[PDB]
Write a protein that binds this DNA or RNA. Structure first.
Ligand code: K
Ligand code: MG
Ligand code: MG
Ligand code: MG
Ligand code: MG
Ligand code: MG
Ligand code: MG
Ligand code: MG
Ligand code: MG
Ligand code: MG
Ligand code: MG
Ligand code: MG
Ligand code: MG
Ligand code: MG
Ligand code: MG
Ligand code: MG
Ligand code: MG
Ligand code: MG
Ligand code: MG
Ligand code: MG
Ligand code: MG
Ligand code: MG
Ligand code: MG
Ligand code: MG
Ligand code: MG
Ligand code: MG
Ligand code: MG
Ligand code: MG
Ligand code: MG
Ligand code: MG
Ligand code: MG
Ligand code: MG
Ligand code: MG
Ligand code: MG
Ligand code: MG
Ligand code: MG
Ligand code: MG
Ligand code: MG
Ligand code: MG
Ligand code: MG
Ligand code: MG
Ligand code: MG
Ligand code: MG
Ligand code: MG
Ligand code: MG
Ligand code: MG
Ligand code: MG
Ligand code: MG
Ligand code: MG
Ligand code: MG
Ligand code: MG
Ligand code: MG
Ligand code: MG
Ligand code: MG
Ligand code: MG
Ligand code: MG
Ligand code: MG
Ligand code: MG
Ligand code: MG
Ligand code: MG
Ligand code: MG
Ligand code: MG
Ligand code: MG
Ligand code: MG
Ligand code: MG
Ligand code: MG
Ligand code: ZN
Lengths: 83, 23, 206, 60
RNA sequence: UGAAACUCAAAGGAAUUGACGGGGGCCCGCACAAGCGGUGGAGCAUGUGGUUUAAUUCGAAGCAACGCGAAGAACCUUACCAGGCCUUGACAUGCUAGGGAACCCGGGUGAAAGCCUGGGGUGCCCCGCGAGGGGAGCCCUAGCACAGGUGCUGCAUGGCCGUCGUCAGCUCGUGCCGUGAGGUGUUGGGUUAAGUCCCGCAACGAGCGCAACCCCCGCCGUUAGUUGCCAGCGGUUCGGCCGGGCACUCUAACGGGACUGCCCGCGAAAGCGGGAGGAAGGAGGGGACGACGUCUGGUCAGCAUGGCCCUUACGGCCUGGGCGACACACGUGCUACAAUGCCCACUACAAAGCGAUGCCACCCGGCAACGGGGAGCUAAUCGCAAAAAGGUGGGCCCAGUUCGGAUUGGGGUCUGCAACCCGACCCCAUGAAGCCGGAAUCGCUAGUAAUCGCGGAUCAGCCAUGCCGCGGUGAAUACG
RNA sequence: AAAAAUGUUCUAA
RNA sequence: CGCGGGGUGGAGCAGCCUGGUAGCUCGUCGGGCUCAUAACCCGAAGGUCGUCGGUUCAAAUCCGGCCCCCGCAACCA
């Protein structure tokens, strides 16, 4: 994991998007490509569109998934098994 | 064995140092 | 394909380098890139002069490019004006005090890098490839060489089925270290593709 | 996609972690040695020509 | 006795060069045999098939494709996919027109690219107490010429490489034989690692190969003596540390040395068997070195290069994804299944390499990864550094274990803009399969195999258990 | 004095 | 609604008699040998027994109906 001598990582551009919504009485649909930005308490209750390489998957963020990265919830490979 | 990282033998294998192989 | 370069094989026993200098790890590549940028310019400009070997020496923010050549008067030009037309354009890409020297090659037909360029141009001019080889190997032997060997690979005469042709006279001991075998390759571009011209000149054993 | 990748490699990048060595002679990206600026192939072509100062075919 | 229709562009004869034979003869190669260790079963690492996928870029295909191109895929790399963007363009030389700039510091929007923007202020020779007007590195906008393509063809190609095979061979010039292909030479007797050499001979020479010249290792000599070494007197905080010395060890350049030169025996000879001297003996051990050719071998994706093909797109920029997928199958490896072992502590003996946003002594914080301090070294000086197996002491007592270390939970560390996909390391916990592997199959003939560790290239980091090197310990066996 | 069958079409560069 | 026999892995046959146990050859799939294929060698998977119903603790096996498929018979006028 990221050395906590450094901060918790959010790309800033995504972080603005959510702090405006809280201030203005949220929420809008947030479409970002920052799969790496850590889910941060200022996100709970919102829904972020995460680009998995093809589509922006919606992701409703709850309290029990905070320490995670956004990419964890938009998988990149579709499987369905073998014939 | 060399695969057991928690030993003075496995640390020699990965070339690393720790409580189980100090300097 | 299996045979090793006769120059690289003899480097240190019969062939000295074309670039001689020392440079600690911190700037070998920079002097090396410069060395290549120089040779590129001169091999282009001094092509019609009969370029055979660019020696590049270097010491302390200065460089001594020594061009061995068939027709030195072509390189120098009018009284040393075309010579200095390069002595400064060289120093415009050298930055250093880039001293230029010109050397006379005693025999052109004894210079493997030129024989190959001669035959390469003869195919570009659509001469008979078989004849054009036997002619060149003939001149090298008349010029006193102890043995010569010349090779054309490619679409000889534009034949769809590409081919290799060669001829050799005297002897050419590629396995001997004390043999002095000048080697020269030239590339012949034609309308039907590219052609490879290899020249081996046995000069003698030392 | 080659010549525009010789160019993009020379340029200074958005992050120093995005820089990669390319052969100065042929532009190859893999097997390029730091000491020469050359890939493992051009290293062999210039070596045999004698245009590489003081390098000699090793043997032991 | 004996047709025809129809149908083929041959059917044939001898001889030649090859290739082939479950024909022959004579030879060789870890080819078998004799051995020793493995692979095939396990878990994992990696390469591939297949499937999957928006894409899982592309190539490699029996030996000689499969830890191969990849000597470093998180972004870059990247050639694939998705979406957002650019259009003389990221890049080259040339021509114009309008600005008339050169360059450096911002700003709005956006994921970024991009698009829209804002500042100041260009010399060059000029007319100068004037407006300055021009012109010029180089910039920028429009217009073109053109760029660009890892798009296709390795069955159009150069170059480079693999392979047969370091196998002993492949040929030429003149002469001779034959109507001719072609033969002779190069075959034969002997000998060699060898078309190596000897004798013979309608052949006589020659060339490419073999050998040799070259590099490392083995003994001795010269030359040198610091950063290397310490034999012997002086100190000595007891460290070659100081005096001092270069003897030795070493370091690195030039030399000597082995040639069947000598003796016995055989033989016509070349040679072969043995002996002596000698560090080394029959080419001392290892390397580099690969004939004419083969395989329409391999590589247009390293590069080059003909032709075909695309041109607001098959070019270019970006962000994200993918190259790491997983019902399966194969190759190459790592780790082991234990007691000739495992574990902890103490303690010895290497070599070759690397090291100035480098290697890091020592110091404190920390169980540790590491962190903070902080000397020395442009390095025979300072550092990576501990080499490990080993030697000693002690613990485990035959258990799926104090064997094994996969898998998984949690907690950290570090490089990096950033470790979700997808990093490496550290610590607590978890502690799977595996009891020596079916049919089948690999390597090695000596300082080899086996086993032990160490370094380098790539490299921010690293999926390295891979590769290229390095020494430590050190066998078994070959009747044939 | 012999276990053991087979190798699609065109092309031979 | 004259009398017999049969239906079970993909094919062809055991197992039913005597209720509890599904078996044999080929085929199919994974590996191996071969340059490759075949043969050959090493492994593995696939059948709820035509069907419905009954007896029984328990049915491919025993009993009754239906479906399907072969065989025999049909004489005296
Ligand atoms: K009757
Ligand atoms: Mg253990
Ligand atoms: Mg044309
Ligand atoms: Mg290119
Ligand atoms: Mg990089
Ligand atoms: Mg690189
Ligand atoms: Mg005949
Ligand atoms: Mg054997
Ligand atoms: Mg095994
Ligand atoms: Mg296995
Ligand atoms: Mg695939
Ligand atoms: Mg391709
Ligand atoms: Mg890969
Ligand atoms: Mg790798
Ligand atoms: Mg990429
Ligand atoms: Mg990209
Ligand atoms: Mg093709
Ligand atoms: Mg080819
Ligand atoms: Mg080729
Ligand atoms: Mg191909
Ligand atoms: Mg032969
Ligand atoms: Mg003749
Ligand atoms: Mg005859
Ligand atoms: Mg005649
Ligand atoms: Mg003849
Ligand atoms: Mg022959
Ligand atoms: Mg002959
Ligand atoms: Mg022969
Ligand atoms: Mg004969
Ligand atoms: Mg030999
Ligand atoms: Mg003879
Ligand atoms: Mg001395
Ligand atoms: Mg040789
Ligand atoms: Mg081919
Ligand atoms: Mg092409
Ligand atoms: Mg290309
Ligand atoms: Mg398997
Ligand atoms: Mg491995
Ligand atoms: Mg394996
Ligand atoms: Mg280290
Ligand atoms: Mg257990
Ligand atoms: Mg068990
Ligand atoms: Mg245990
Ligand atoms: Mg975890
Ligand atoms: Mg990762
Ligand atoms: Mg046991
Ligand atoms: Mg075994
Ligand atoms: Mg051997
Ligand atoms: Mg071991
Ligand atoms: Mg590295
Ligand atoms: Mg991994
Ligand atoms: Mg290593
Ligand atoms: Mg048949
Ligand atoms: Mg046809
Ligand atoms: Mg059935
Ligand atoms: Mg059946
Ligand atoms: Mg019965
Ligand atoms: Mg019974
Ligand atoms: Mg059965
Ligand atoms: Mg099968
Ligand atoms: Mg074949
Ligand atoms: Mg088969
Ligand atoms: Mg069975
Ligand atoms: Mg019934
Ligand atoms: Mg039953
Ligand atoms: Mg009657
Ligand atoms: Zn290159």
């Amino acid at each position: 994991p990221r050395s906590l001598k450094k901060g918790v990582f959010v790309d800033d551009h995504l972080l603005e998007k959510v702090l405006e919504l809280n201030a203005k009485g949220e929420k809008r649909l947030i479409k970002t490509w920052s799969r790496r930005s850590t889910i941060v308490p200022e996100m709970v209750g919102h829904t972020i569109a995460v680009y998995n390489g093809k589509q922006h998957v919606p992701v409703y963020i709850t309290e029990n998934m905070v320490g995670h990265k956004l990419g964890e919830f938009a998988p990149t490979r579709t499987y369905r098994g073998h014939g | 064995g060399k695969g057991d990282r928690r030993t003075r033998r496995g640390k020699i294998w990965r070339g690393t140092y720790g409580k189980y192989r100090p300097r | 394909g299996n045979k090793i370069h006769p120059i690289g094989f003899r480097l240190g026993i019969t062939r000295d380098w074309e670039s001689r200098w020392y440079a600690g790890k911190k700037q070998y590549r920079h002097l090396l890139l410069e060395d290549q940028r120089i040779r590129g310019l001169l091999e282009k400009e001094l092509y019609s002069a009969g370029l055979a070997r660019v020696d590049i020496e270097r010491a302390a923010d200065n460089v001594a490019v020594t061009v061995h050549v068939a027709k030195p008067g072509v390189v120098i030009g009018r009284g040393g004006e075309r010579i200095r037309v390069l002595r400064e354009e060289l120093a415009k890409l050298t930055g250093k005090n880039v001293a230029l020297n010109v050397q006379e090659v005693q025999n052109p037909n004894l210079s493997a890098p030129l024989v190959a360029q001669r035959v390469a141009e003869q195919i570009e001019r659509r001469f008979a490839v078989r004849r054009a080889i036997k002619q060149a190997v003939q001149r090298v032997m008349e010029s006193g060489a102890k043995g010569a060997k010349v090779i054309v690979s490619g679409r000889i005469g534009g034949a769809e089925q590409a081919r290799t042709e060669w001829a050799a006279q005297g002897r050419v001991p590629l396995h001997t270290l004390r043999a002095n075998i000048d080697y020269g390759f030239a590339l012949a571009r034609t309308t039907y593709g590219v052609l490879g011209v290899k020249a081996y000149i046995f000069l003698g054993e030392v | 996609a080659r010549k525009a990748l010789i160019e993009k490699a020379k340029r200074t990048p958005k992050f120093k972690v995005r820089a990669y060595t390319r052969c100065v002679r042929c532009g190859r990206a893999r097997s390029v040695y730091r000491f020469f600026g050359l890939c493992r192939i051009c290293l062999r072509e210039l070596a045999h020509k004698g245009q590489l100062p003081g390098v000699r075919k090793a043997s032991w």
